[PDB]
Paper text:
RNA polymerase (RNAP) frequently pauses during the transcription of DNA to RNA to regulate gene expression. Transcription factors [name] and NusG modulate pausing, have opposing roles, but can bind RNAP simultaneously. Here we report cryo-EM reconstructions of [name] RNAP bound to NusG, or [name], or both. The clamp and shelf module of RNAP (collectively called the swivel module) rotates relative to the RNAP core module producing interchangeable conformational states that have been termed non-swivelled and swivelled.
To compare the effect of NusG on an RNAP-EC with [name], which stimulates pausing, we reconstituted a complex using the same nucleic acid scaffold in presence of [name]. The local resolution for [name] was lower, reflecting its intrinsic flexibility and movement relative to RNAP, which is consistent with earlier observations. The consensus reconstruction closely resembles a previous structure of a [name]-RNAP complex in an RNA hairpin stabilised paused state (backbone RMSD for RNAP 1.3 Å). [name] is positioned close to the RNA exit channel, binds the FTH, the C-terminal domains of the RNAP α-subunits (α-CTDs) and the C-terminal tip of the ω-subunit. However, in contrast to the paused state, RNAP is post-translocated with an active site compatible with substrate binding. [name] maintains contacts via the [name] N-terminal domain ([name]-NTD) and the RNAP FTH, the [name]-NTD and the RNAP α1-CTD, and likely the [name]-AR2 domain and RNAP α2-CTD as observed before. The [name] KH domains contact the RNAP ω-subunit, but this interaction is dynamic and not stable.
Author numbering:
A (entry chain D): 16 to 101
B (entry chain C): 846 to 945
C (entry chain E): 2 to 91
D (entry chain C): 1045 to 1342
E (entry chain D): 1358 to 1375
F (entry chain A): 56 to 165
G (entry chain D): 303 to 503
H (entry chain B): 221 to 234, 249 to 329
Amino acid sequence: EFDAIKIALASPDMIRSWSFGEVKKPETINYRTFKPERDGLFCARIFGPVKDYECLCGKYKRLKHRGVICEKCGVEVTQTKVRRER
Amino acid sequence: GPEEITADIPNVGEAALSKLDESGIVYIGAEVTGGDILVGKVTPKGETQLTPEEKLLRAIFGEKASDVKDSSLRVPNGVSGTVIDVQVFTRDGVEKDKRA
Amino acid sequence: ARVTVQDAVEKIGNRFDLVLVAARRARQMQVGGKDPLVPEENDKTTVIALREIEEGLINNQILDVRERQEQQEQEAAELQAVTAIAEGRR
Amino acid sequence: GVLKIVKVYLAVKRRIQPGDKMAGRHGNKGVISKINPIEDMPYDENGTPVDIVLNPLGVPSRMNIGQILETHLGMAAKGIGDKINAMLKQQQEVAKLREFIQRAYDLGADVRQKVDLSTFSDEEVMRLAENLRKGMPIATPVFDGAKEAEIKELLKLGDLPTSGQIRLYDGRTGEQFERPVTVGYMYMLKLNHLVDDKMHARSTGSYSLVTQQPLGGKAQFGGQRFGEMEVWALEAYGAAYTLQEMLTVKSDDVNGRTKMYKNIVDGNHQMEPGMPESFNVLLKEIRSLGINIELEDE
Amino acid sequence: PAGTGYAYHQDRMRRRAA
Amino acid sequence: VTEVEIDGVLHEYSTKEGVQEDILEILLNLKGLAVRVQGKDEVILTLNKSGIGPVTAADITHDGDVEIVKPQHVICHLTDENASISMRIKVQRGRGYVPASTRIHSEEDE
Amino acid sequence: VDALLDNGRRGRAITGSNKRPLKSLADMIKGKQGRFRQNLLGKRVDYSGRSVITVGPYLRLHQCGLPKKMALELFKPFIYGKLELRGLATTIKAAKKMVEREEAVVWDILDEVIREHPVLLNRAPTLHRLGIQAFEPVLIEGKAIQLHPLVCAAYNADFDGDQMAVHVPLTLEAQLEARALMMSTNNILSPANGEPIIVPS
Amino acid sequence: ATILAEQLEAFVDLFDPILLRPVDDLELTVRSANCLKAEAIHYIGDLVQRTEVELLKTPNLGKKSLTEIKDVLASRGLSLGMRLENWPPASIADE
Amino acid sequence: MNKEILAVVEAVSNEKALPREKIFEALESALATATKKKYEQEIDVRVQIDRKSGDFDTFRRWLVVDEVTQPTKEITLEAARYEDESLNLGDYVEDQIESVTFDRITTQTAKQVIVQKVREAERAMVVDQFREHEGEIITGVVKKVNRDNISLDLGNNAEAVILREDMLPRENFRPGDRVRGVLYSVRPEARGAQLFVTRSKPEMLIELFRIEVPEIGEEVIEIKAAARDPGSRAKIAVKTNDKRIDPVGACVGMRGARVQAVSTELGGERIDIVLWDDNPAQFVINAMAPADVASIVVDEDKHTMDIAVEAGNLAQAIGRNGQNVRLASQ
RNA sequence: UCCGCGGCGCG
Ligand SMILES: [Mg+2]
Ligand SMILES: [Zn+2]
């Protein structure tokens, strides 16, 4: 599976390649509605969905969809473990 | 919404839900073991989606709770014994049940 | 039941390879298993292998040769079955 | 932000069991070993069986020699107490009782105590003898205690051997022990370190959020911690597979234990190692600051 | 590559990565 | 004795008016009381007492066969003018020593 | 940016709580309570238990005591596997209810499954190689761990209230490691020097 | 063993509750007193003497007593075919 | 008044799919039964519930029998002298009438009682389209996996289940495939009523005679008898309707245009049909193809035929596994 | 409870 661990400096290009979006707001979480809004420390498009196989706006709810992007909230549909990777 | 301290809990049997009083507070002086329910508590789930079962049952029943999550405690595993005394504290401006 | 391992250590001229060979033998015994070579004492397959090693009939050189023999026989049986299936329609 | 709070109390009549901890008053610790039936205890000539059998070999090493003298003095304390119970059992008259108490209080050297039951009462003396049936109490200020002569005189006042050592009889054999054994009345305690507040196990339960390990503590079904030095202890040994499974399958990898728990039910006993997610999380924190890090190839 | 795994580790080193 | 039925009590750890000592002390004192059973196996006793003063086992309402051997064993202490207690005591014979924890093994009537 | 990357290095710009130096991405790796020594070398494990020590003279030195409760809680996956094969139940929920009801038909099964299944034992201050051993357990009523006396010399463990933890190996490789090396009978000379360890104490 | 046995040879010494009770313990309401209490039936066994078909001896019971009549059947002693001898049934004998 | 039964009956996305009175007939009775179960009295309850104006109530049945069945509200000949001689065994008249029962506990037990009631209500409409055609072209897409069978989360407001001998044994109706056949017996399966797709029986294998040939469905080709294996091979007598023409390419398609399309939805196998003609001798010789005919003969004095063919290159004419001659007699 | 600090106590 693996043979070596290589460590070196990170270019801005590599940082941009890693980043799936950007964060411009100091918002943490919306109140009176415990759901995240657009770009911030938490988000939906930037880091992925909250509920597994469930978009933020509830547009598509079934397990067969993979990689589809909604227009109200642009997110993919996969289990929430992606929040640990993106 | 605020939680309820009703004596109704879904997906449980009356064999465990026999010692508990209708007011939602266990009888004074009743031997209990691990896993038994002492006080029944449920929380407003929030609908956010109307299933066909919720479409049918809510209107006919007349009660629109209509299926909420439970938050009742239970005796921690390992400890048992008797319930010598129960205390009830309620804030002002809110009605009190018969037990208080 | 077994209390020591010293007999198996005396048989196979190392102690670390004993764990590997006995693990392979016992795993073969448990999943996809065949008959043991010693009349069992209603014990688990973990200890059955160690009884066989100290009995001086199972080791790494015996086990891998038996595995090669059985896989060669199974491949020959596969070829024979393929030929028989081909000749069935003929 | 809370509507109303309700509280309940639970009463547990927790009794004694193996695995507790009792001690005297001289640091002689102990953990209860096994509760035996009454007959198996060593019993003296008058049938009365002992209740605690301590190990004397902890005496000369820990050097706490005071507990032996405490035992000897306490044994004499019941000697007056038992005899008082003997006279009161057959309703002995007051003049035989009172005088006897005058003989117990006036022994020893010129102590500061000076008690005269000739001038209290009759009913009060009867009540005092009633309260002394379970054993005549003895006080001893710290650095002036009774020496060997005083306790010997107190022992002789009853009907007991002076040396304080009697002959016992084993319940299993019925054969006299060839050497005398020291018996007496010791004050013993009870400590809160109970066994049932410590014993807990865990097959599989909850899991933390930031990194996938079982929690800790008796509450919320924690799992015991494979210590850092236990890794070295296994490392010095030859068990590589044990350590691999210990820190890969049973603890961290989500795909590991989930697939392992499916195999463990169907008779299969094979692991499927992966990548510890705690190491993976760390990788992100290494990639987060300014430095690239990744696994090289296959 | 110290205890039992050393035999496995040697096999990977000699058969693979070569 | 195995079980008792103190009338106005709800649980083992509460108390009562007039009675000098606790219910726990009552049960600890009463567990040492000795009886004799000849004909039946699970006889039930009854105690009724009023007035002020000590209460012994001698006032136990006897039956056809139940015979007390120590009638001067104290149980409670009545101090108030009107604190009459009424208890029902269950006695069964057997062998060995049986703790109260094992008695809960039935799980049809308790 | 300085406070985010390494808090407390230059200005200690914390202002988290009332006099509380808050952590950082540098602090969450380094230190005693960082990431390495906290969750990468010594990692908490499943299939474990902890209880109090008790001496037992009636059992041989390659076998140790074990209470019913700890064994039944530890070997729950093993109980499910053996029970399903015998056909007492059909679904995992029925087997879980059977374990939760502790009927008489599970104690015999637990006796069958533990006949040749070694378990591990270690003290909390594991100091040298002999601080961890293995024993083939024998089910005994109680709430503590019965233990052979002589091996108590190896642990340097007295009986004033010391506590032990139990771990259970699962795979055939791990069990064979236990039986071949981890047992008490296989370690009768110290790694430090040739003197015995089963010396009468 | 026999020796020890010899040493101990001269030493060893080797029903229907309704039919047996009055009508005062029945589980019937007071509105149906005309059917049983006012029909010369002072015992529960007298009311239990009628079977599931013979219990129509008195039609004076009210409409609400019909549900109360079924409430007697919940005790498993009435409205099912019980037949007392005169007061008690055959299984309610106290011999 | 209830003031909500009318809204329930005129929701009407789910109410109008089934009969408009179904909710007031079956669901109301199920709710009454659940309320009676939640009640202490074990009495049969009949719900007189209508969605017209909210006049919904409950009644306690009498259960007039010769015993104490349903003893909470049982009736018998014990009231023969008081109920105008209404004694019988089997009558279920309404002895009493309940008023109302909110039954919040029954609202909790809804997941056990009313969930099954709603499942039965959905199954009532499911069976109206599962196999209501009593045998026709019914298709199905497989989306679920079931033990000892092949599941399919198909349409028609229901599921579908195929047995081992129902669909093609070589390729069952599993994830990544579809079926198309004929079925008429559809009972209530698990989780409501379900359809049935069996593309291996005669009703699907022999149905290709008018779905694959281009001149058979218009009654221009003799297609009246066809016996074939399930989803493996087919050997039927492709003949013309007394036209005395070459019909070998009629039912098998021109240049093999129907051999791979006769059972494309049933598994996609290859078939080898036999030919025929208007001459009885030629038809008898060619009906068992491949058969090496060596003589011509016919018997009519007895209920038997005469297969006069060789067996050297015609091992299927004598019959080794029922490949060519098995459908010849048909 | 699961996020963290501080205390007291056990070995
Ligand atoms: Mg210690
Ligand atoms: Zn969405």
